[PDB]
Write a protein that holds these residues in place. Sequence first.
Motif, PDB file in Angstrom:
ATOM      1  N   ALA A   4       0.832  -1.197   0.000  1.00  0.00           N
ATOM      2  CA  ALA A   4       0.000   0.000   0.000  1.00  0.00           C
ATOM      3  C   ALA A   4       0.881   1.267   0.000  1.00  0.00           C
ATOM      4  O   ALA A   4       1.939   1.321   0.652  1.00  0.00           O
ATOM      5  CB  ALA A   4      -0.850   0.006   1.267  1.00  0.00           C
ATOM      6  N   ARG A   5       0.458   2.302  -0.789  1.00  0.00           N
ATOM      7  CA  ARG A   5       1.178   3.573  -0.821  1.00  0.00           C
ATOM      8  C   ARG A   5       0.091   4.597  -0.536  1.00  0.00           C
ATOM      9  O   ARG A   5      -0.603   5.045  -1.466  1.00  0.00           O
ATOM     10  CB  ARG A   5       1.873   3.781  -2.192  1.00  0.00           C
ATOM     11  N   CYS A   6      -0.049   4.969   0.756  1.00  0.00           N
ATOM     12  CA  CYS A   6      -1.212   5.749   1.246  1.00  0.00           C
ATOM     13  C   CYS A   6      -1.046   6.208   2.708  1.00  0.00           C
ATOM     14  O   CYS A   6      -0.076   5.845   3.369  1.00  0.00           O
ATOM     15  CB  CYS A   6      -2.418   4.833   1.132  1.00  0.00           C
ATOM     16  N   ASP A   7      -2.073   6.959   3.253  1.00  0.00           N
ATOM     17  CA  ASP A   7      -2.058   7.326   4.667  1.00  0.00           C
ATOM     18  C   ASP A   7      -3.329   6.778   5.340  1.00  0.00           C
ATOM     19  O   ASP A   7      -3.809   7.374   6.304  1.00  0.00           O
ATOM     20  CB  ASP A   7      -1.928   8.849   4.907  1.00  0.00           C
ATOM     21  N   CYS A   8      -3.836   5.601   4.905  1.00  0.00           N
ATOM     22  CA  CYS A   8      -4.981   4.957   5.594  1.00  0.00           C
ATOM     23  C   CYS A   8      -4.683   4.776   7.088  1.00  0.00           C
ATOM     24  O   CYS A   8      -3.557   4.468   7.501  1.00  0.00           O
ATOM     25  CB  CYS A   8      -5.296   3.589   4.979  1.00  0.00           C
TER      26      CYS A   8
ATOM     27  N   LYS B   1      -0.962   6.817  13.123  1.00  0.00           N
ATOM     28  CA  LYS B   1       0.045   7.065  12.080  1.00  0.00           C
ATOM     29  C   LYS B   1       1.402   6.582  12.581  1.00  0.00           C
ATOM     30  O   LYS B   1       1.659   6.588  13.789  1.00  0.00           O
ATOM     31  CB  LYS B   1       0.087   8.569  11.751  1.00  0.00           C
TER      32      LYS B   1
ATOM     33  N   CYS C  64      -4.881  -2.629   3.984  1.00  0.00           N
ATOM     34  CA  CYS C  64      -5.956  -1.664   3.747  1.00  0.00           C
ATOM     35  C   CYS C  64      -6.467  -1.880   2.306  1.00  0.00           C
ATOM     36  O   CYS C  64      -6.075  -2.846   1.623  1.00  0.00           O
ATOM     37  CB  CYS C  64      -5.447  -0.244   3.956  1.00  0.00           C
ATOM     38  N   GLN C  65      -7.356  -0.946   1.835  1.00  0.00           N
ATOM     39  CA  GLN C  65      -7.856  -1.050   0.474  1.00  0.00           C
ATOM     40  C   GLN C  65      -6.750  -0.989  -0.596  1.00  0.00           C
ATOM     41  O   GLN C  65      -6.936  -1.519  -1.690  1.00  0.00           O
ATOM     42  CB  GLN C  65      -8.935   0.028   0.206  1.00  0.00           C
ATOM     43  N   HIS C  66      -5.587  -0.419  -0.274  1.00  0.00           N
ATOM     44  CA  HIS C  66      -4.474  -0.265  -1.243  1.00  0.00           C
ATOM     45  C   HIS C  66      -3.476  -1.412  -1.271  1.00  0.00           C
ATOM     46  O   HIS C  66      -2.623  -1.473  -2.169  1.00  0.00           O
ATOM     47  CB  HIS C  66      -3.757   1.054  -0.958  1.00  0.00           C
TER      48      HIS C  66
ATOM     49  N   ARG D  33       4.995   1.145   4.395  1.00  0.00           N
ATOM     50  CA  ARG D  33       4.518   1.960   3.268  1.00  0.00           C
ATOM     51  C   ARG D  33       5.543   2.966   2.762  1.00  0.00           C
ATOM     52  O   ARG D  33       5.432   3.424   1.608  1.00  0.00           O
ATOM     53  CB  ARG D  33       3.208   2.657   3.645  1.00  0.00           C
TER      54      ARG D  33
END
Length: 140
Positions: A48-52, A72, A110-112, A132
């Motif tokens: 994942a490449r995101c801030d979920c 975080k 997560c979704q990513h 990530r």
Amino acid sequence: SGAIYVGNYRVVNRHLATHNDWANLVWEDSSRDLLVSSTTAQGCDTIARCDCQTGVYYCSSRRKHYPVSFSKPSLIFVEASEYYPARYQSHLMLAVGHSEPGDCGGILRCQHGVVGIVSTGGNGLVGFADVRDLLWLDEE
Ligand SMILES: CSc1ccccc1CC(=O)N1CCC[C@@H]1c1cnc[nH]1
Ligand SMILES: [Zn+2]
């Protein structure tokens, strides 16, 4: 136990790395509890490449995947164990969830894609080491 298999890399908790991992080492960081080794076969996980801050993790001590909200990645004081004494663990995210000794490795996603793996916990907490920011896992 558990690992992330992305490209020709195997991502494991540093404290659970085997001799074969250390003999095929790509990168390790004790402050993050992470070690990456090289593999002959290509893996299927995607990072994942995101801030979920919401996702699902695997808990081997319950044979179940749980949905969680998590913090975080941060620097947090973690207590001693048999593998570590008490210290600042970096790039660590916390959530409320069951964990007990043995669950290190389980994936948080997560979704990513994959967000990180199980590293610390207790008292109905479970921590996870984030991956990530390790952009190089996606290439070479
Ligand atoms: C999900 S682990 C767990 C869960 C509930 C309670 C205790 C643990 C063990 C643990 O935290 N360990 C053993 C190696 C890494 C970590 C650690 C961090 N710094 C020192 N020890
Ligand atoms: Zn995400």
